[PDB]
Design a protein around this nucleic acid. Sequence first.
DNA 1: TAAAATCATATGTAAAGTTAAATAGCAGAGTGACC
DNA 2: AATGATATGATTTTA
RNA 3: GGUCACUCUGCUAUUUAACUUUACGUUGUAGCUCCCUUUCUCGAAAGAGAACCGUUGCUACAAUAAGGCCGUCUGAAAAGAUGUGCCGCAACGCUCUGCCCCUUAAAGCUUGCUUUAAGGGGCAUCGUUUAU
Lengths: 117, 1049
Amino acid sequence: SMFKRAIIFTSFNGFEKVSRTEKRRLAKIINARVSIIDEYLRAKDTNASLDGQYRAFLFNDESPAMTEFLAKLKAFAESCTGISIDAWEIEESEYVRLPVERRDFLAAANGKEIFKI
Amino acid sequence: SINYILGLAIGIASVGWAMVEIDEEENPIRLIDLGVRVFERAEVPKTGDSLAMARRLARSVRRLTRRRAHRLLRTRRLLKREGVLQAANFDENGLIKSLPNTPWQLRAAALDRKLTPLEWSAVLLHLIKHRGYLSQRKNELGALLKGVAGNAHALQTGDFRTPAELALNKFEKESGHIRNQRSDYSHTFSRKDLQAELILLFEKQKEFGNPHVSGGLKEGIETLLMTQRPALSGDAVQKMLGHCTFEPAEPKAAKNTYTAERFIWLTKLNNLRILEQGSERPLTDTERATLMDEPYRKSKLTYAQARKLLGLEDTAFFKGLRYGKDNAEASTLMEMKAYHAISRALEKEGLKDKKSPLNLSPELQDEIGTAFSLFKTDEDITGRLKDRIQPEILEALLKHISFDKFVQISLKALRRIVPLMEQGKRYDEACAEIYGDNTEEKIYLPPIPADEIRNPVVLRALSQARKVINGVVRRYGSPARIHIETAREVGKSFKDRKEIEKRQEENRKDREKAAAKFREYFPNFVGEPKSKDILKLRLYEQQHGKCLYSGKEINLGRLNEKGYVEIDAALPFSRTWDDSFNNKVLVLGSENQNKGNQTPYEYFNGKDNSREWQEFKARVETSRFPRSKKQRILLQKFDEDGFKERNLNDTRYVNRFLCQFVADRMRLTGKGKKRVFASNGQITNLLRGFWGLRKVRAENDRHHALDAVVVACSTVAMQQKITRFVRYKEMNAHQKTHFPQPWEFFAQEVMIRVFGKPDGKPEFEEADTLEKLRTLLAEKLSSRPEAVHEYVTPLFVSRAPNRKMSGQGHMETVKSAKRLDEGVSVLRVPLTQLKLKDLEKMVNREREPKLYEALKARLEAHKDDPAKAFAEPFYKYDKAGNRTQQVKAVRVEQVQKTGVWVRNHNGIADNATMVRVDVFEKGDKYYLVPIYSWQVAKGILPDRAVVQGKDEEDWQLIDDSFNFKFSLHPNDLVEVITKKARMFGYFASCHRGTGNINIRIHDLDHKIGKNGILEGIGVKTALSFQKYQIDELGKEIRPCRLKKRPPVR
DNA sequence: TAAAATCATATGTAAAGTTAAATAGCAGAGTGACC
DNA sequence: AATGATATGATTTTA
RNA sequence: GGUCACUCUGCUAUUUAACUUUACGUUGUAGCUCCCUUUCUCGAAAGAGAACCGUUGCUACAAUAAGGCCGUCUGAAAAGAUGUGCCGCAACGCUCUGCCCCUUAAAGCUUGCUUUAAGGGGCAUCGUUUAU
């Protein structure tokens, strides 16, 4: 029961316009993982929720959940050509040892980056 | 003479009740009695609409139909009297024999030629029957307004003279029909337009020969086409008005009234506050004198304009203004709507000059406002005030003014108060200076006053609660105290209840997902993850993984390690009684010790603003907590007793009224002022959990009594026992003892008394009878000798009877009764509703096979969705492949064994309400005679009983050779012993085709029958069939026997 | 085969206006208890 | 879109 | 400065109760019309012309709960005239009126029961909201 944390930063790169379709697609990918436990992470198809946002998803490893999640995010980002997603990983010890304010920026800085696309 | 508390769980369709005997110290000692009254929600079951609203709509369409028919009959009488037609032209009923069926053509061609007697009469009758809409407004849009305005603009534009001409030219060519279709509103005209057509037609026909252009005829016809009754009679408004706050004799004043408007303006002015630099101040006397006359001198006062007039500053702002909103000071601060309205009316009518004050007395403006607000017709306002003002002013005002909306205070009191407020005093000060600052109690509660409660559903709930209260008082004397638990659904609208159903379903799904995630995080967690564990995880993540009390990091993975982390009540339960989620925080077991019964403010010494208090405050502020939770946790100075009371009492409006009413109007032999007590639902559930009664798995109506029992044991003595126990538990201090209970083995006693089975197992056969129940309590509760006594009887659910003899006569769709010799009706069905099953029963299946095959192919092509299949128009082809005529509805056959004759005996509809079933016995066999509402209306007493295979004409006839046993209404208690089983239930429905009956099990236990209903009980060969009597409280169950057969009357 | 259960399927609607009352949320001024 | 409860055709089971 | 209840004002949302109209929809009857089954007539065919019946569309007229009534005037009345004519699917209640239940009297056939009466309640075909 070793807990990791997948920090994702989602943004619009401006090269191509983002369809309402793709917004709903990314929102569905994200919201699959949200519940009442972490309902502050919920994704709407608005530009506010998607463009330029940090989301730290809690994961238990020795389970392929995190890997499948990150794979789906990577596939979507590479397929979308107009949305950029960056994914880092941090251990939950380190994550809760960080200050509350600006926590996700610090976690991305202090974590292991998984992919920048 | 028994000391007992009456607990009531008041639901929207049920009242559970319990009687618990108490000590001399208000201690629960014995469960005297319990029951459940069950009834129908006072609303339309399908839609939730008001019953009175449906009744009123039916009544209004009755009036509309009556008045249209009367208008046309009057017009015919006038046509006869003005020498347009002779007695020869009218049939025996009173209709014109063979009048032309082309009044549109005759209208649009009445602009080119003279008209015959018939053609003129037909044009007039058609104009009066179809007279369009009249704007009744006082002065964004739907289909009606858009269509009316479009047609108005089209005839006003040119090239079209009258709406009939426009109709023929445009509508027929471009639509194929003149009148409106299913949902269409395009071909609709203004009454003003048709009146214009009327005057033009009369003058044109006057020149075109035509003897009948009489003045009398024209005036009569125009009067008939234009006149309609006023919405407000001239007495309605006062009848609905309501009393003053201070003088109940005097009625409240209208808003559009110099005195009342001055009162509103003085309130707003005196209550205005301004914030400068961290400070708050009222307007000074000079500031108020600067502003006071301004709303009379300007259109609007406008906070920004007030700022200008006072030269306030950029640093000074108005209190209670959302300055985030970008032009917050553009809001109207005051607008003397009545003053400027009267002024503008007289200005636009030429009796008033701009830049000059109104020359009318304050009293005169008061009179004008009240008369216009109380009366909406020229006659009424005239009779009211054409005596006290000049007629010129009256004409202008009737031309331009519309007033509504009263001010809750009488003119008398307002006239006393407004000078006192004028000299700078606040409202409270004024009415304190003038007026400073109740009903005998009967043994039985009086009827619930409909004036106070306007929700009909809440009215019925409270009325049935009154029935139950008066029952228990009649049976056991005056109660010592009454405890109430109103459901969350009582007092809310239908949409609100549907919303809370949807949200609780979504919450169930969310909790399922949360449990799944919790399982993923903790694969080796033991058992089902309960609500506390999900809450622990949620609080962990929502507190950023930090202990709230210490700020130390929390180790996920050790989350379920016993005592590692606790869900602590921030405010102590002993002092606040708060078990809401806004008082629960995740702390380390380490740090939440020596905290005791202190609050965070007291624990961290926030009185001295210590470092620890500031750190704690920062932690809770940075956390993902709702503002309410943050405010609660950081609760500094507070009242112990007050907080306990607010959490205990549940003060929604229905509860408030109920407590007030019952305490003030009914005799209660209790200790202290609060002899009526309404419980917080959350605390009732908390006590239910701690006292040993789980949420029952079974689906039946008895659990309501369970809730009532718990509410009865929420006594001050029990409450303080709980408080003391929780205090000790907080300080960690007579070993495993446990939560206090009303008495030993409370849970099992209550469970057995309510359900007739032991607490553990619901598969035990219920103790259906008194002796069996007493044996069960004696066996399972041998230690408790007070469990058995003379009042112990099984819970039988009492169901509100419904023996009303009036109801809906028949279904609202009328079917062709031409072919009723064979058992069929013919209804004409739109293609957008036609289905394969229906298509098989089309009348013209045999005649026109191609159309049938095309329709079938179109439905098959679109997966049998009639709307999608027939979205684009359908046409009957004609041998060669040329589309010919359109199809929009086709005649379909339906089975019709019986029905109700309607529409001058030329239509038939299905039955709606079976009001009675008369039960007769011949030999040793039972026979049922149904009586419907239309039979009651026509006054006919049926004489034919049901036979399963046959139609009504082949039914068993009833004569003196038949004993009459009784009459059944819906929800009459019945017993059927059939030598296969004994069944005892409430008669719900009788089956015309089979002759069987349906009965509801008293508690509607879904285990027995189809959701608690025994559908299809035969009675013809029953050993015994009897009718019973039961009371509210579900007691005194007796057989009853009618002497004579009751009339329908 | 009669009588007693079971399965199954249908239920009138939408535009416009004049009113009054009640509830609740928010904002503002107070009164009365308490902390 | 249904939302519900009643009325009742049609069909199966039981005795 | 918190908490609760209450009074007043403003905005907003929802509901409740009443009223005045409109416009459809449904059934019946016409007029015209679209198909079409029988049977005739005609035709080489295609398919025309007719008569019931079914029935598409359009237009009109009646009815729109089933059922009950009112004010006046003509009439012996059955009916005529006339009207911005009035009720009718609900909720609540127990003052009046029914039915049912219970209690208490009294008389009785043989204690049990039946009447009858009063009182208490439940529910209505009774009353109020509720009309000219």
